[PDB]
Design a protein around this ligand. Sequence first.
Ligand code: ZN
Ligand code: ZN
Ligand code: ZN
Ligand code: ZN
Ligand code: ZN
Ligand code: ZN
Ligand code: ZN
Ligand code: ZN
Lengths: 335, 335, 335, 335, 4, 4, 4, 4
Amino acid sequence: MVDYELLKKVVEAPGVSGYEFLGIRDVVIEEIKDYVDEVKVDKLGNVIAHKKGEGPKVMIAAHMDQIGLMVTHIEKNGFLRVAPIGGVDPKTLIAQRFKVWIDKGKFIYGVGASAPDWDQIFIDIGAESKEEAEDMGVKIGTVITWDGRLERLGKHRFVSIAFDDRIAVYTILEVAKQLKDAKADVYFVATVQEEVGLRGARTSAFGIEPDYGFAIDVTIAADIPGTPEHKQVTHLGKGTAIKIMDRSVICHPTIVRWLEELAKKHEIPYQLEILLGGGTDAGAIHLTKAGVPTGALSVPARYIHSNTEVVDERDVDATVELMTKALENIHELKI
Amino acid sequence: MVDYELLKKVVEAPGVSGYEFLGIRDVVIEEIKDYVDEVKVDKLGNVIAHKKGEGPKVMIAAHMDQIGLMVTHIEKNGFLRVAPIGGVDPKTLIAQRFKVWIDKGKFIYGVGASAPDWDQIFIDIGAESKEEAEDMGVKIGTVITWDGRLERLGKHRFVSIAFDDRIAVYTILEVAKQLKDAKADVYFVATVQEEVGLRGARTSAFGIEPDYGFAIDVTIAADIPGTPEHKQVTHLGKGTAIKIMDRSVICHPTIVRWLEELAKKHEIPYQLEILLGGGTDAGAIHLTKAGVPTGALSVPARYIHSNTEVVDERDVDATVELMTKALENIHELKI
Amino acid sequence: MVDYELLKKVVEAPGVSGYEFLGIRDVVIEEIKDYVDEVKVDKLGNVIAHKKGEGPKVMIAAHMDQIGLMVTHIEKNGFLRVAPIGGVDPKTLIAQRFKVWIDKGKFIYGVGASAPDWDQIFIDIGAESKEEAEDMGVKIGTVITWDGRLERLGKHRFVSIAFDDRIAVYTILEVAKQLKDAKADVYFVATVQEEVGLRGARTSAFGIEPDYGFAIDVTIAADIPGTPEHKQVTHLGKGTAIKIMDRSVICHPTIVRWLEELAKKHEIPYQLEILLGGGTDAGAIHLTKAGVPTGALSVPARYIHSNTEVVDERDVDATVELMTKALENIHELKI
Amino acid sequence: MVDYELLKKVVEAPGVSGYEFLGIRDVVIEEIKDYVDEVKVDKLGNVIAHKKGEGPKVMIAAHMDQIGLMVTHIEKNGFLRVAPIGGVDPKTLIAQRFKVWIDKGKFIYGVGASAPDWDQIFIDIGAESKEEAEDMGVKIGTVITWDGRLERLGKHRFVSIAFDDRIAVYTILEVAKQLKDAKADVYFVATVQEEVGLRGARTSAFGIEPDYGFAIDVTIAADIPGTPEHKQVTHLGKGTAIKIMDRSVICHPTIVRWLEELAKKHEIPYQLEILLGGGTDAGAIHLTKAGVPTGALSVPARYIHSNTEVVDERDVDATVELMTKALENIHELKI
Amino acid sequence: XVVD
Amino acid sequence: XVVD
Amino acid sequence: XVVD
Amino acid sequence: XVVD
Ligand SMILES: [Zn+2]
Ligand SMILES: [Zn+2]
Ligand SMILES: [Zn+2]
Ligand SMILES: [Zn+2]
Ligand SMILES: [Zn+2]
Ligand SMILES: [Zn+2]
Ligand SMILES: [Zn+2]
Ligand SMILES: [Zn+2]
């Protein structure tokens, strides 16, 4: 149901917050340029892909940065100490393999070791001293990601590192490929630094000054053992999730119901999402300048912020379909 | 290695967040005006010193507000209750002497008394009743700072109140004095209210709309007894600290390495800084309008947010030197 | 320094306790048969490779079983519950990828989820119901291993699943290849079920009735950050570890010193090992029938019982060398 | 569905570990002798009933010892202090009636009294002094069992003391009665001291030296209120339980699946069993001499190790049937 | 049943 | 996903 | 220095 | 390695 090869390219490219230029940036540019009129990279590194059209100016954002680690110190015996880039849980770093990036397109393996707190965590790269670790290319500031790869789980699901929005990056790439003569001036944006504060979405939205804003991200799917039914949030395979509100934004009620009605009309499976906490790019977009009415479509995902996030292709397809239909009909929307 | 008299003037002038106009503002204006083309004070009180030049527009910010206390209530027997202005730790107020500001350039002494929490802290000014305290000039809203003075510690170090950036204010004053025919349109800004939320940096950056942003502040130097080596952050005397990232900002990687290369080329001692938390003016500057590539140079400081902060003159000189070199070569920077 | 391809073959073959026949068994037989006179598989599944010689009958054991998981229940929504095979720590199962074995040479991926205890752990294989999980080939009793692969760490180290003795299996394969006309009747044994109680070593030793017994296994290398020097046990790269005693056996003092003297004479790096707990096949071998004088050589390993165990090739080579020298000179040993 | 009178005889005969000769031994001999060629009692007290046949030598073990208490001290006022024989939980001794055995076939009543720990437990036999208790026949070493009797619970269930394997003793007696001209050399063994360490099974298996081993015991049936579905282990009435593994043994995979296939072929209800802990006679049998491939059939039982254990006749019949079919077809088994 |  |  |  |  999804373009597996394309999904693999987007999830496996490195790109931690602030360092998206090391891999994911070029993948997004290469895969979207032939479907838009112009592609530009702004000050902070956001990739802005503009598809000219006659209608409301619409910004669709999917963050391309992923959570990771940064080397803070190299111990006398070669072990590495780290700081989190984004909301990383120490429990997900123990007895795990990592890719320690020594240069663009170059990495060496590392092992995470030693509930665990940050001053107890360290990375072993096989060095015997600080000098050897440095000769291997490691320095204070070296970025690290899990050694994760995309794989299939059963008939419709997948496991991978960084679905937390590389699945949304995949989604906008697919939407850009499907969109044909839409009555709207579209700006697809692969935003930077969402994991550290919705930073890229804030600056790109300011520059674009859209009439309507849309974010595509993952949302909590806690439909797992031991979770009370009312706390599951979303269910895998039950459709794209239309966000009503999360801690960072209360989606415009008119857009929420407009999306719900569009889903019903085109027989696209969907579910309604409400989060007690969490934050998404929409949280920044809607507060741009004099205000921007916004909505958000989310891909349900289990085990978010780990090397083993899980999504369902049926929900991904539903998200691509609903966003495409939204762009084709937004010229009629009356707020 | 530093202009001791000038440093004393900047650290001993009162200027708590929101009330910088009571002392530090005038000191900054007086000490920088003869080295720039124009000096202006904006809406919130930021001091903007413009030095015209041919090149990129660059904003260099150092916050002039310091942490302190504000009177919230006067007890029946004349004792004062207080609220913190900025991140003040009660442990630093016990058995300490304070300057209670009753007017611009006028203060009376106070003694802090009674781990301690805020409802247990009080200030004794020698009054016997609420009426006497009021006759002495105290009111709800009266601001208070520690009674601290600059002194030397050994050959290269110093102890003082408010190094937490008055050392950066000193730094930009020195940079302004050294800068000669730089190929850049420079805006030196002594920002207000950094301690309560990077507020002054946000509004001044919006008005200036710089091409490049730089903040100068203090950073953690925990190179003291009992601290694990990987948690020391920076070391006094080992150079100016080039910030890679803190909780408020991920400095532009190109600027970070550009600064590091400049330091190496000009033989300026430096060290790399990463903070798990903390916040600096750069956190506001870089998110201005459509985004601003930023960097930050920090002065390592021990015992931050107290009346006894400690810095090393060698790191201060390195910061002045590197910032000066950065401004002289920024016209060549390619991001 | 090691035959990388051979090591990869032995560590990546599945073979949890009691189910060694699913993969590792055939690898051992195939890789050792051309270097011995006869290869037999006994009642419990031990692989006994006999190399005829004139001298003392010697048994050298390396366990081929690895720790893993077994499906105990399939939840209504397709999730799997598990029980440990061997000493598995729940902390090493969180946000990890697994190979769920549905048949010999056939697996599907699984994700571990939800300090964690066993009733909180579960595996997600992408199934939506118990029926779907069963159609995918899963049943009560299905065995599972981590999805781990051999990789290099720096110049001399490696990371892999199951070094906990697949490194010893590799060692005996190498010893069998190097041994030439040794004055000893050698029995190389790849034992089963060591992780659940030194079971295979007990039954194979009974049948062989050796004059001398030797076990090769991994031992604790806790030469990592935060560990007191006296609690490190062994150090990676400092040589093969000659076991003095662990909780399961007090190696014969004459053999211990004989091995130490042999190491010195042939300039083979070595270190002495003492464990407060732990257990090894020697613990069963030495108590066979009327008693068997035994010794044990261990390969120092970090992060034992996880998907990211780490060893140093220099210690592995030292172990191969010392065991080979021991077999060539054991005919002179006088106990 | 079961021979009620025979079951009553086996469960109500006294026979705590080490003292099986006081009652259960003679019951087993009397009830099995007419169905075998010879009956012998070995050194430790195991009852070995041999039924000659042409085929593999097979040992089928069911332990005849039951848990109980032993008098450790007689207080000045006649109360008795006790030590457990086997894994007895103090909570099952409070306000309970006991049979205090003063001689073979002679007992007096006792009452257990005073979560409870061992130094708080005591038995009241109505004596007023130590001397009176001794005159009544009690001494240090006197054994005690609960005063329990077999009774029916509904249509298919029963409640009784010592089902924990007297139900297996009943099973082998029934199998011995049904077995006709089996192609196997069968040794039915009522083992001693299983509750204190699988002791009788170890020595009898050594002497018999079987080609195949089978144990019949009870297993956990936690299909009661408040127990999570994945922790129920087995369900009453759902069939004989084929053991895959428990803490003491990993049943030979070939035998496990062979038994499962036999059950399917003969339409005998069965369920698969996996225990995180627990121990059974198979744990000793399979490690005999050079190893013995073994399997185990268990009777699901609720409230194990108490005076009120509960089993379902349908599971008991299924166990008798499957074991009988196994013995009749074992000559074809190829391991 | 050792244990339970 | 900030937070989770 | 916000925080420390 | 039983135990660790
Ligand atoms: Zn039992
Ligand atoms: Zn029992
Ligand atoms: Zn996200
Ligand atoms: Zn996220
Ligand atoms: Zn500051
Ligand atoms: Zn501060
Ligand atoms: Zn081992
Ligand atoms: Zn082990």
